Coordinates of C-alpha atoms and ligand atoms in Angstrom, one line a residue:
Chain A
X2 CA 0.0 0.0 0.0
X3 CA 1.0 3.6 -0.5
X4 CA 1.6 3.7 3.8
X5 CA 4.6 1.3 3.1
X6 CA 5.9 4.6 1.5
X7 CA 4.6 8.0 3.0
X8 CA 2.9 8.6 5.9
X9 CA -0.4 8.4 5.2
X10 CA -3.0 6.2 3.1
X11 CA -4.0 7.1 -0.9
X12 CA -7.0 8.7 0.2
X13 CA -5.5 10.6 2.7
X14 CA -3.1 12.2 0.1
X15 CA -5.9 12.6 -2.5
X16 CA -7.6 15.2 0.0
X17 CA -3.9 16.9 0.9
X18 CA -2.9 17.2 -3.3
X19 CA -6.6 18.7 -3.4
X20 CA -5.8 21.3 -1.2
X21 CA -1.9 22.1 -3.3
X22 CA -3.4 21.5 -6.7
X23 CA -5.7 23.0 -8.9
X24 CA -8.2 20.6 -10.2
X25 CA -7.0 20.5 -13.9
X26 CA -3.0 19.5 -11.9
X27 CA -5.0 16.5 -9.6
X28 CA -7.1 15.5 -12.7
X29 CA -3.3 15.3 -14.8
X30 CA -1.6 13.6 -11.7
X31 CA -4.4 11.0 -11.5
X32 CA -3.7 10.1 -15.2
X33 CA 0.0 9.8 -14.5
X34 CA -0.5 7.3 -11.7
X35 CA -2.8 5.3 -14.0
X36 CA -0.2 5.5 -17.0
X37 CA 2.9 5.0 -14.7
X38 CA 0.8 1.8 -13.6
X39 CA 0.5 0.2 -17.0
X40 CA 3.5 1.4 -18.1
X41 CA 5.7 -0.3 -14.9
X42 CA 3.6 -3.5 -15.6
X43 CA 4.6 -3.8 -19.8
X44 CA 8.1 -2.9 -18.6
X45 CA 8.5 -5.1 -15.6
X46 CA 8.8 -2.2 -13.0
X47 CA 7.3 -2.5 -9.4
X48 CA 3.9 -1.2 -10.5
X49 CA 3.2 0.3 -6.4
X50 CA 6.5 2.5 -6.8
X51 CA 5.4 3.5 -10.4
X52 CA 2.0 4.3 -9.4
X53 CA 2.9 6.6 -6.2
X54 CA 6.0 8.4 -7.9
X55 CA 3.6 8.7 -10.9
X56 CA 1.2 10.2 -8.5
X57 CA 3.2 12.3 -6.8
X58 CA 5.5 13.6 -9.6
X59 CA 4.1 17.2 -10.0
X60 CA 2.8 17.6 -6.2
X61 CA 4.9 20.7 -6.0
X62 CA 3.7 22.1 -8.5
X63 CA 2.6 25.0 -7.0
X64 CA 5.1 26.0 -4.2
X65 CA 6.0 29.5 -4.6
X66 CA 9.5 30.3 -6.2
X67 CA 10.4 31.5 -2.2
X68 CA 9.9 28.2 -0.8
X69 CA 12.2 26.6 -3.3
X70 CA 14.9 29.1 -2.9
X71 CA 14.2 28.5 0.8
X72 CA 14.8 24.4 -0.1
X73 CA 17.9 25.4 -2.2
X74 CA 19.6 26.8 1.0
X75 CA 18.4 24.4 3.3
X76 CA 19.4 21.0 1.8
X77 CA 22.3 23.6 0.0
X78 CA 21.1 22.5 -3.3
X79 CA 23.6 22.8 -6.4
X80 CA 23.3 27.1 -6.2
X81 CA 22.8 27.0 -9.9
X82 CA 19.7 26.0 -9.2
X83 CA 19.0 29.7 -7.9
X84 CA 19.1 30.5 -12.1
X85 CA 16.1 28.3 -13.0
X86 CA 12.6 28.0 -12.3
X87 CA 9.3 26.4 -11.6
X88 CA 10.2 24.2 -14.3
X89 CA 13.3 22.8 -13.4
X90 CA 12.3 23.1 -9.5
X91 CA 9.0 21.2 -8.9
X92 CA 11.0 17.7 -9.3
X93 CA 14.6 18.7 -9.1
X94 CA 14.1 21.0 -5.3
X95 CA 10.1 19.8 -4.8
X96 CA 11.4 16.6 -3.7
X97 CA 12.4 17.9 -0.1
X98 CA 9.1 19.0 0.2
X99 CA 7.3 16.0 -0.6
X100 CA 10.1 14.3 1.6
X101 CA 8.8 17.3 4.4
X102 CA 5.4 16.8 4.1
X103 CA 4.9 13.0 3.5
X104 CA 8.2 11.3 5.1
X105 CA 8.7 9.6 1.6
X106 CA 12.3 7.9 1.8
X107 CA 12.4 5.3 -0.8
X108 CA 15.0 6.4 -3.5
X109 CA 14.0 4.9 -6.6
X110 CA 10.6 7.1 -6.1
X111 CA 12.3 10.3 -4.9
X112 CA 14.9 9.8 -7.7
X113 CA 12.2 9.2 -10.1
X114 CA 10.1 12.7 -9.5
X115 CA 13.5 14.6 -9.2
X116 CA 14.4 13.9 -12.7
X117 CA 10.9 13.7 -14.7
X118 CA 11.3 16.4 -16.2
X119 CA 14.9 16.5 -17.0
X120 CA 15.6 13.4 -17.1
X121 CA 19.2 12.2 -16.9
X122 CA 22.1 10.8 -18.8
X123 CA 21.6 7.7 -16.8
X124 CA 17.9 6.2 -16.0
X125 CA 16.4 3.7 -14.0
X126 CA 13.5 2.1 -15.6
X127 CA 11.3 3.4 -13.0
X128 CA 12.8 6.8 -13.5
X129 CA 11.8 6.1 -17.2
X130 CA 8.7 4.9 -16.9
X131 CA 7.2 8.4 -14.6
X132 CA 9.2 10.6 -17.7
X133 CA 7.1 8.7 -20.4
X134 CA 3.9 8.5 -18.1
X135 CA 3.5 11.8 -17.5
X136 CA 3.8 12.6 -21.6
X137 CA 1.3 9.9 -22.5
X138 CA -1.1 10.3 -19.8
X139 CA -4.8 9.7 -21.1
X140 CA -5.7 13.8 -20.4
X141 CA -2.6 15.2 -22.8
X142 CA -3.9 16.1 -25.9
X143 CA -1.0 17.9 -28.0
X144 CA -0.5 17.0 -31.2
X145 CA 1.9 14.0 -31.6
X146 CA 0.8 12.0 -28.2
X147 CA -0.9 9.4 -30.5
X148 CA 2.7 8.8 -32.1
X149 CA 4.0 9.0 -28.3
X150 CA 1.9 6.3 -27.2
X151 CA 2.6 4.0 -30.3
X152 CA 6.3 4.2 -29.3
X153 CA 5.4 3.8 -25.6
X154 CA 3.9 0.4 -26.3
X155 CA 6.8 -1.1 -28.3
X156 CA 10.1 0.7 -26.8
X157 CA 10.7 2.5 -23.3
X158 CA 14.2 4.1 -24.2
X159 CA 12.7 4.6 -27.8
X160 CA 9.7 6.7 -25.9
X161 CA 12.5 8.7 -23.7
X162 CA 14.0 9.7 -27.0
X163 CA 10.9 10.7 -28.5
X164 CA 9.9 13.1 -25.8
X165 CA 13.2 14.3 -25.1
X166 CA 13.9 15.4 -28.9
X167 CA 10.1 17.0 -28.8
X168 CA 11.0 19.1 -25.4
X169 CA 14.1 20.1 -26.8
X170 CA 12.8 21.2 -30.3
X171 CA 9.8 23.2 -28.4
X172 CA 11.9 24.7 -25.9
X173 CA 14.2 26.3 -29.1
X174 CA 11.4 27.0 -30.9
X175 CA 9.9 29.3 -27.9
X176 CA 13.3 30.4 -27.2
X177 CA 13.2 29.1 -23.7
X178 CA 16.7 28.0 -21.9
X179 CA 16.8 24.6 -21.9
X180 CA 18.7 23.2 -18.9
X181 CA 21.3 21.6 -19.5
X182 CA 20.9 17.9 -18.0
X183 CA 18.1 18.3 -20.5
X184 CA 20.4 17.4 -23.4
X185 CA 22.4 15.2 -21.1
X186 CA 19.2 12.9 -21.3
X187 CA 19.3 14.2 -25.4
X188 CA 22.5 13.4 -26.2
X189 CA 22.1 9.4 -24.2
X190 CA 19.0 8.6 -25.7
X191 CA 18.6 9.7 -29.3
X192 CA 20.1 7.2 -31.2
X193 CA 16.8 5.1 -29.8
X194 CA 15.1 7.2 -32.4
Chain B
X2 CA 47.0 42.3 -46.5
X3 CA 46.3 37.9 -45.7
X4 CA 50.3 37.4 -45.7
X5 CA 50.3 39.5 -42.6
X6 CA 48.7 36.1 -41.4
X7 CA 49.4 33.2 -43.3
X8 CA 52.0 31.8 -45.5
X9 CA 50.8 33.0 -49.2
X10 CA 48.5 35.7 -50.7
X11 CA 44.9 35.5 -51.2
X12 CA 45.1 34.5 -54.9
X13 CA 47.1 31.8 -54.1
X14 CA 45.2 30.5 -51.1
X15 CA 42.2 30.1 -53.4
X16 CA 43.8 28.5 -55.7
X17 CA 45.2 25.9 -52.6
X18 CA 41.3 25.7 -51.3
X19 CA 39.9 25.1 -55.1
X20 CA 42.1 21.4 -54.9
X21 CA 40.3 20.6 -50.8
X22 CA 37.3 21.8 -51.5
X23 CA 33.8 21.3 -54.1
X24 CA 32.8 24.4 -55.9
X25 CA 29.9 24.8 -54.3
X26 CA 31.8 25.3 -50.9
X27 CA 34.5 27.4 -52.2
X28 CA 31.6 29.9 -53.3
X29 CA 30.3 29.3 -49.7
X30 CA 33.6 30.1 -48.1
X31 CA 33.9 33.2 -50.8
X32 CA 30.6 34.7 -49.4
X33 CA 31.1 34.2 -45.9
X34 CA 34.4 36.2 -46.5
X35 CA 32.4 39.4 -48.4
X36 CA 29.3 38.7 -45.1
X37 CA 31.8 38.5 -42.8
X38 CA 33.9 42.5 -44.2
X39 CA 30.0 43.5 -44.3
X40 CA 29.0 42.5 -40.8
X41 CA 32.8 43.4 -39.0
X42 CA 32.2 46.9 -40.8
X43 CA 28.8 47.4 -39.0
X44 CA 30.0 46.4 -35.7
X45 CA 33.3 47.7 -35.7
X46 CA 35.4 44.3 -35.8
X47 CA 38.5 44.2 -38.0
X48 CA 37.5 44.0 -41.5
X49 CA 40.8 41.8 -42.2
X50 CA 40.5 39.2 -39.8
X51 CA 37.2 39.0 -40.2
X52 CA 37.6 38.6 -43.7
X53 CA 40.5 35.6 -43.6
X54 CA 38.2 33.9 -40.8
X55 CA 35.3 34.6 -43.2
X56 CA 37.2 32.8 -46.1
X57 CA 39.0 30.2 -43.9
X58 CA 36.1 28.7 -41.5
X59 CA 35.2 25.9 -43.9
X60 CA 38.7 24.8 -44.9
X61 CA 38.9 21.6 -43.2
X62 CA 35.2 20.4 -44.3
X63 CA 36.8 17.6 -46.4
X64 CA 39.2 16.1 -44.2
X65 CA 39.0 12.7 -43.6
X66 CA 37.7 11.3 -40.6
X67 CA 40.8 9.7 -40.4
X68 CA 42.8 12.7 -40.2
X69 CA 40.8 14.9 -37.7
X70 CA 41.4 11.5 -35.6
X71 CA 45.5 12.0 -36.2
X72 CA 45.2 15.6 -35.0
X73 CA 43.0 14.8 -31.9
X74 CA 46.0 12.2 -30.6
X75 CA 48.9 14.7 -32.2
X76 CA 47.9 17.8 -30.3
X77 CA 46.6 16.0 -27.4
X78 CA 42.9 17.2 -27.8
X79 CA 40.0 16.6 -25.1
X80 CA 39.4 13.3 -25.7
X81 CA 35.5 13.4 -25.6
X82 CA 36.0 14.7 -29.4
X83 CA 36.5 11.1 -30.9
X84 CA 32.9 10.4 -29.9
X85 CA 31.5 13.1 -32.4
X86 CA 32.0 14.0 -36.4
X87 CA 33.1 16.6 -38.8
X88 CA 30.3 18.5 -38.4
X89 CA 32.1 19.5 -34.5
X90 CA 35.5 18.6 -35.6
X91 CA 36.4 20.8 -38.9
X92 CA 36.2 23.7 -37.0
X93 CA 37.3 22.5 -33.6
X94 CA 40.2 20.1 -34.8
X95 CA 40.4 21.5 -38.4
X96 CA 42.4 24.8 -36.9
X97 CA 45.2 22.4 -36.8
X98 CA 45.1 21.4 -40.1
X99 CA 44.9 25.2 -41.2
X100 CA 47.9 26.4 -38.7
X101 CA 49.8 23.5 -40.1
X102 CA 48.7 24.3 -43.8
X103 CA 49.0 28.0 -43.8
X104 CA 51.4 29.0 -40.6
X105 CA 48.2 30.6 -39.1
X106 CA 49.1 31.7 -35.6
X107 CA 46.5 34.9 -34.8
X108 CA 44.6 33.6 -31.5
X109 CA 41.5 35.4 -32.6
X110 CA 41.5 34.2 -36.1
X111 CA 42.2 30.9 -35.0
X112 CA 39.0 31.0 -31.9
X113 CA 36.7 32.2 -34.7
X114 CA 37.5 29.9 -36.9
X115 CA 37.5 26.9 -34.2
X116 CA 34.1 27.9 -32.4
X117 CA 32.1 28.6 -35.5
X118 CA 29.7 25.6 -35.8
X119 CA 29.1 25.4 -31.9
X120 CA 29.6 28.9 -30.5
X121 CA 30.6 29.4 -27.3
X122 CA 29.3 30.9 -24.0
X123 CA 31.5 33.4 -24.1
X124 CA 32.6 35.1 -27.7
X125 CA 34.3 37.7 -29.0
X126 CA 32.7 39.7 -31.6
X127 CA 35.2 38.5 -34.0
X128 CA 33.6 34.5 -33.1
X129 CA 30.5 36.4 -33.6
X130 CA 30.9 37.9 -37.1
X131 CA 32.0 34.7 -38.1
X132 CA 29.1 32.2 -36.8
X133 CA 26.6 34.6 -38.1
X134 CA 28.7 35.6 -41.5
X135 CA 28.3 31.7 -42.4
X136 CA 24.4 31.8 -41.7
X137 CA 24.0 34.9 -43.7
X138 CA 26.3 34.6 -46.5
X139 CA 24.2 35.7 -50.1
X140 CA 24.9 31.9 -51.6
X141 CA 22.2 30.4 -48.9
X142 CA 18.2 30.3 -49.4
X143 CA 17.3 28.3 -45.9
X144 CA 13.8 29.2 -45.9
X145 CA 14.1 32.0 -43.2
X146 CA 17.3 33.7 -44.5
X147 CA 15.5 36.4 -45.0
X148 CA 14.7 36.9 -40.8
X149 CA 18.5 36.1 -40.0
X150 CA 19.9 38.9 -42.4
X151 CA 16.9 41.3 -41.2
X152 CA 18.3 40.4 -37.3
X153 CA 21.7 40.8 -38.3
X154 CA 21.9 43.9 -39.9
X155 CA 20.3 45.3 -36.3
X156 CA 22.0 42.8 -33.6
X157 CA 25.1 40.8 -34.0
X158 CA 24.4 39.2 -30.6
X159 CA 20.3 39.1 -31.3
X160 CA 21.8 37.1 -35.2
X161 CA 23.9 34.8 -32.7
X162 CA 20.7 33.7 -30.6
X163 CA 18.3 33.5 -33.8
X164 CA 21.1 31.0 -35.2
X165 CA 21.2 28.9 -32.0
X166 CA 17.8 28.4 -31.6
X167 CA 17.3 27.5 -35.1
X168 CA 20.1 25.1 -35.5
X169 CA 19.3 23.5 -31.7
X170 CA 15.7 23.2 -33.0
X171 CA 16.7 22.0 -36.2
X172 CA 18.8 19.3 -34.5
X173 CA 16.2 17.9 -32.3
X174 CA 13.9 17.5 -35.1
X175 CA 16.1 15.8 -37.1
X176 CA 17.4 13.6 -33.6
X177 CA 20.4 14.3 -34.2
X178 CA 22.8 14.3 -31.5
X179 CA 23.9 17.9 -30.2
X180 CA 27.6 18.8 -29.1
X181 CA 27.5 20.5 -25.3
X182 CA 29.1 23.5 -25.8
X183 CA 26.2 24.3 -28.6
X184 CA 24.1 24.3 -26.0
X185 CA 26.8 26.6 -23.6
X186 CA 26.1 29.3 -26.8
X187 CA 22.1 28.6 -26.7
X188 CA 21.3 29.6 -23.0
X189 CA 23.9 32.4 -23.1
X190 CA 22.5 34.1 -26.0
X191 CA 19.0 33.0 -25.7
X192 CA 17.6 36.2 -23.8
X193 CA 18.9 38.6 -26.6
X194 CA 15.5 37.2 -28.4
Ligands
TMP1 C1 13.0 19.4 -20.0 C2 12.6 20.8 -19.8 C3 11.3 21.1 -19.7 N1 11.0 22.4 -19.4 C4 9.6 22.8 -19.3 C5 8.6 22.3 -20.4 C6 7.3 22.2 -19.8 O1 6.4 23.2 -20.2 C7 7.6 22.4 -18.3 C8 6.9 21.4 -17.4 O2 7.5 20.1 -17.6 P1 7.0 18.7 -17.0 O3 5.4 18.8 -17.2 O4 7.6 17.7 -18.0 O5 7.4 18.6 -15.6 O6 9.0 22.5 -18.1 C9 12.0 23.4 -19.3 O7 11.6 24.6 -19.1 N2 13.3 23.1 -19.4 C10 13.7 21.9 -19.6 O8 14.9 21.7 -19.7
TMP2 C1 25.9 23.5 -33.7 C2 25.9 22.2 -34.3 C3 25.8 22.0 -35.7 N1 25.8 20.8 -36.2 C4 25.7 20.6 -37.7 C5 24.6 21.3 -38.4 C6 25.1 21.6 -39.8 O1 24.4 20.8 -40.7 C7 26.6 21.1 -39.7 C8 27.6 22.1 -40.3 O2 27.6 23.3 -39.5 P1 28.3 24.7 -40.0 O3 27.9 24.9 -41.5 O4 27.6 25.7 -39.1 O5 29.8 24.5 -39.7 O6 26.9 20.8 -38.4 C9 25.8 19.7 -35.4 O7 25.8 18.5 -35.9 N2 25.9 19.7 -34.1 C10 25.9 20.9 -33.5 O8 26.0 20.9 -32.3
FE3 FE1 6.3 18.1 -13.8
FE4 FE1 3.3 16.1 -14.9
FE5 FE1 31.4 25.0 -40.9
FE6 FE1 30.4 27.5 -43.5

């Protein structure tokens, strides 16, 4: 059960993320644990851990960019970090506050929402499984996420690659910075393509 | 005049580049030298160096893999480089084969040259000239030339970040791998957007 891991049952943390998270956030959340579920059971990952670090992957979300420069200090975080934002924060810095909030220990799930949306050079299948979950998730509906999906159901690393070359072309295209274990991830996975 | 720099006289260094290289680049290489005068003259870079970097950037584009291998090992290159191609290595290895060719010893000549595919996070306006000189130059018809020539004749560092963006975007739609220290250039620049 999800009390083997944090410090209170599913229902439980349904009722805190309702309080953190708006309800379109929750709704999104909810379709990550499903997908991290089926996902973790075609891949041969431990379908609990996918479920709850697909679940929890975007509970901070929300914090305000204060309380992560507060977490920065506190757990004195890489103080490049202090450059990003929301976007690099809410799995990279966000979990110390799930950590805070829910006494969640386990580090294949903590390691798994640090990097989901950055991935890294180096992933667990778990870790790869809550990345590709939270792209395919039944609620997305860019354009593409029919080709995503496809590819999720034949190849894991080939579904990594896929959404890692999109992010990257989108983030160039909006000219966003693009940080830069981003194109670690890139760089490890494209030739899955 | 060039032999304050290399070895021979312009005439004659055209007629050593018309043997290394298709006529197609040579014309290249010929109008990144008349963009590069152009764009040094707006923004108040020497009109000479710019010039010989101008003509010079694409001189090693036809060395063997083999070779740009040899020169990695001979001058005791980073390493990492023998995990990439010619698209990082004729400007970042092929220097060599220009300061061996052409007794080429100008440090800023020699950076422009080197950094002109992948930029830098930190370039002169020299580097600058050149990277956007070879974007520019009147031989290409990219579709969105036009935009790039517009930004250049207003911002050499606004030209720069157009140029990243675009190739990094270009790159990751292709999936095609991306070499770091493109990337270094990308989020340095990206702002001037
Ligand atoms: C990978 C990556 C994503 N993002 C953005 C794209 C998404 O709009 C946003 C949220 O990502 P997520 O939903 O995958 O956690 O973060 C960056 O800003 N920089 C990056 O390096
Ligand atoms: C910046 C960059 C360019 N390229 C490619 C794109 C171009 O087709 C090719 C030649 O570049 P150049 O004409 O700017 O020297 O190199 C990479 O492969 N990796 C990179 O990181
Ligand atoms: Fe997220
Ligand atoms: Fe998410
Ligand atoms: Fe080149
Ligand atoms: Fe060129």
């Amino acid at each position: 059960s999800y009390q083997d891991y944090i410090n209170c049952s599913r229902e439980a943390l349904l009722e805190k993320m309702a309080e953190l998270l708006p309800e379109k956030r929750l709704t999104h959340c909810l379709g990550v644990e499903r997908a991290a579920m089926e996902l973790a059971q075609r891949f041969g990952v431990d379908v609990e851990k996918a479920s709850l670090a697909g679940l929890l992957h975007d509970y901070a979300k929300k914090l305000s960019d204060q309380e992560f420069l507060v977490l920065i200090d506190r757990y004195q975080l890489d103080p490049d970090l202090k450059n990003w934002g929301n976007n690099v924060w809410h799995g990279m810095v966000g979990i110390y506050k799930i950590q805070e909030d829910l006494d969640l220990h386990d580090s294949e799930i903590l390691r798994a929402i640090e990097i989901h949306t950055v991935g890294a050079g180096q992933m667990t299948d778990l870790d790869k499984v809550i990345y590709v979950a939270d792209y395919i998730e039944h609620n997305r509906a860019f354009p593409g996420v029919d080709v995503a999906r496809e590819i999720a159901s034949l190849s894991l690393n080939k579904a990594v690659a896929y959404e890692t070359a999109r992010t990257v072309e989108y983030l160039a295209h909006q000219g966003f910075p693009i940080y830069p274990q981003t194109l670690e991830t890139y760089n490890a996975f494209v030739h899955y393509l």
